Design a protein around this ligand. Structure first.
Ligand SMILES: O=C(O)c1cccc([C@@H](O)P(=O)(O)O)n1
Ligand SMILES: O=C(O)c1cccc([C@@H](O)P(=O)(O)O)n1
Ligand SMILES: O=C(O)c1cccc([C@@H](O)P(=O)(O)O)n1
Ligand SMILES: O=C(O)c1cccc([C@@H](O)P(=O)(O)O)n1
Ligand SMILES: [Zn+2]
Ligand SMILES: [Zn+2]
Ligand SMILES: [Zn+2]
Ligand SMILES: [Zn+2]
Lengths: 266, 266, 266, 266
């Protein structure tokens, strides 16, 4: 006779968990996550901002890289998120406990974060992580300012209801660089049509392709670097092959249309 | 070079996950969990109560056994807990979504439940589960009444700060049976002395031994049946060898004293 | 010298607090709130649903009217909300404590409900109420079924980010009646243009006028009955003068356009 | 015919709302609240701590006094609480939004804080305030360290289940000063005996008198200064008549015994 199955851990490709030293993107913006998971540190004269943290076990590595950059735990002021899945919001609860950081997120991301990713619209309880509370709720197009760097929220619902693109302007060589950190536009194993948990899913993805296409976007970054053709291990040429926001959105829409056709067939 | 380790799932002995048919304890009280995890159903003319649910993957099995007993999802009114660890409160969030059930717990258990067992005083984030909210907060000695069965809370802090014994009076052969569902009194791998996260840990365990010793207790049940010498697979003799509350408390205190001595040596 | 001002209570017109006996709308749908605040009871063979509860002090009155209708506290299964302001969600926390009811709401309404209406985008902390937790989060167009009555959520953001219309089909004289419970479309004292807390406010109101115009709508009801020209004190002619959803939306848009023009001038 | 009563605001004596300039207690410790509500600022080389905030409308005044002391919003690191009633935790939610501050509290205080003081064991929904979340849960006897000042929690349940005394050592004239910020020991209008919401109320108060009597206590402060015979308007003699912790506890117990006798008679 047969016992219920053991709980299964959320396991990922090794490269997603491979630590890297900080990689500079612009004068105040650094990649400090792993080879294949983005975690952006933005350093200001008035404290630091983190956009995404990657997987739950990455907290101490993030703190090490912040230290290397001159950011102590007390200096971390704000955490922002692309979306509240385990491989991007994983270490947020632990980072809040170990630093001065407060979380800003939209309502959808906040409720998923507070559930630790449980009762996911598509994954159920298969991919969970330590829950955390949001300190500030943001609305579409709202700005947050830290040390004079202005971050704007652009909602792009689909991958999760709370999926967000974050944009800000940094500098490089004395010239402004408009950075767009755009969320995933994938739908991995999702039921797209007639989904009772997400009835307007397709309409939301279509709007989000348009949103991403139109972002202020000298440089595009994504939570998985491969999605925007970044190679974090490629040093001085890490961002050389990066997609524009237009090309990223077009690729995502073409992929999405193909998935829809397959779902209709399958 | 070396990636961060993969997340590790909370895995348990097979017998902890082995489904069993309902085993009657008294006229209205049934064991409906697994061979080695207690989940008690108390059926009243005015709805049902569940005390503990076991592991997260046990939700559907619990619902099956309730159905077998004549309890539909709408009939489940109340969930009570021994303590909010993954192997006793595991399926609570899912049960709340799939039934009419509301959760009553003390403040300590409620905050741990809402974190999904994360940031545990002793386990860190090693043993987590889907978070759930409590609908009612109870105080020490408070009663809750369902269909005329009266449940009394007896706080017994130690194993967790929110550890609770639940007592009620059922019947068997026309005579009252005072049932005591006493929580774990173990301290598995805990730092007992000078623990910065739990400075009065030893004082709390000592008080809890006294509390358990004095419970109204014709029949003792525990979240792990082995702790009270129950054998759920032994049919008509399942409870024959069960400890008294006095003997359970004495055994736990002797074990605890030995662990203290070993900690001092080790 | 001068002390800080005393806290000021949220006071309302007397008619908003004037109890009324249940007024039947269709075969299973009743108005059970006050003369000028809507609270709809929908009775099914499988339990009851409440849509809105009015002000915080209305809980006991609601329970009295439910009792008069044959609905005991245990029979109330579900609370739905138009929006989470004090004069519609006021008694929700108390109703959850005193009944079997669980709350279903969208993410925006859930986070405002959990704050008890504090940190409102427009009112600050001026209009607060006892906080409550949502048991189920719903997405736009999602359905909830109770005793065979099907409720559909239609998001209509503006008055609050989480403003929702609820629609369902009841019967009257053997014929179907498509009921639309549409939220407020007012913006009382709001900064409409360039609002940093709600940057897309005007775009959201415009979309919501279109949403309301298109609802399945044999009979329109609104949280303030006057907004849809209901007169709950008018007995057999209570709903005689009621607006269509089209006329309600058109009136709201004309009002809104006038407010925009005044804001530009003022 | 008669409408339901209007909501009634929580109004207090004018002196409770009378702003005062900062009054120094020891080298790093200041009273910065009102004439009759304590709010203690402790300034360290590594950020500031606030113990209590008074009433909800005191947030801006607190921020003004912090500014006068050289503490900017970003410098406020930690809020601690005596108990989570409206006249001590009132402005906590707003302070968290406007500063860098995180809240540390025990489980009981955290759950009451998250409800905004609603569903109080004794007051019901009569005295509510904006809800806030705790960032850190503390256990009895646990320490928190900021800039080298060590704060110790001493639970003293009774006035609320989560009532806490906070102790720390400051300096004055080159000598250590052991400061005890002891919570209220009052029971205003409480049912003491046989209270179904608080069955061990009397036992908890008795233990708390003993706890307070034994605190390290060169200087006693209380949330209402009058309770410890402080006069914040008396300048250089503000603390001259202050009670010892022993005398404060003895007075509270004598008062409590009298209230018990009256309850038995009345
Ligand atoms: O290309 C992307 O956007 C992408 C790539 C891989 C995986 C995913 C999502 O499943 P995650 O972001 O939740 O991991 N998204
Ligand atoms: O004897 C007991 O009380 C016992 C036995 C085994 C394991 C444990 C605790 O680790 P759990 O209750 O969290 O599983 N406790
Ligand atoms: O016509 C309406 O929709 C209306 C009427 C009066 C007041 C209001 C809003 O302020 P409330 O719904 O928050 O009370 N709205
Ligand atoms: O002496 C005291 O401790 C005292 C004095 C006045 C009022 C109270 C309590 O009601 P509060 O602390 O909730 O205001 N307590
Ligand atoms: Zn994802
Ligand atoms: Zn345990
Ligand atoms: Zn409103
Ligand atoms: Zn108080």
């Amino acid at each position: 006779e047969v016992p219920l199955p053991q709980l299964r851990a959320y396991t990922v490709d090794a490269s997603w968990l491979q630590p890297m030293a900080p990689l500079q993107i612009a004068d105040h913006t650094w990649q400090i996550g792993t080879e294949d998971l983005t975690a952006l540190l933005v350093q200001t004269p008035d404290g630091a901002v983190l956009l995404d943290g990657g997987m739950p076990q990455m907290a101490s590595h993030l703190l090490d890289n912040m230290k290397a950059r001159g950011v102590t735990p007390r200096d971390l002021r704000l955490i922002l998120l692309s979306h509240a899945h385990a491989d991007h919001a994983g270490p947020v609860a632990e980072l809040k406990r170990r630093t001065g950081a407060k979380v800003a997120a939209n309502a959808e991301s906040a409720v998923l974060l507070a559930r630790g990713g449980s009762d996911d619209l598509h994954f159920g309880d298969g991919i969970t992580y330590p829950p955390a509370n949001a300190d500030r709720i943001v609305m579409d197009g709202e700005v947050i300012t830290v040390g004079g760097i202005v971050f704007t929220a652009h909602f792009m619902a689909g991958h999760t209801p709370g999926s967000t693109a974050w944009t800000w302007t940094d500098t490089r060589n004395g010239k402004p660089v408009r950075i767009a950190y755009a969320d995933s536009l994938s739908a991995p194993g999702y039921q797209l049509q007639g989904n009772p948990r997400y009835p307007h899913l397709i309409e939301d993805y279509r709007r989000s392709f348009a949103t991403v296409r139109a972002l202020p976007c000298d440089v595009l970054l994504t939570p998985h670097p491969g999605a925007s053709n970044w190679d974090y291990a490629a040093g001085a040429r890490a961002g050389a092959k990066a997609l524009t926001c237009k090309a990223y959105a077009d690729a995502a829409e073409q992929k999405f249309d193909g998935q829809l056709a397959k779902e209709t067939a399958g």
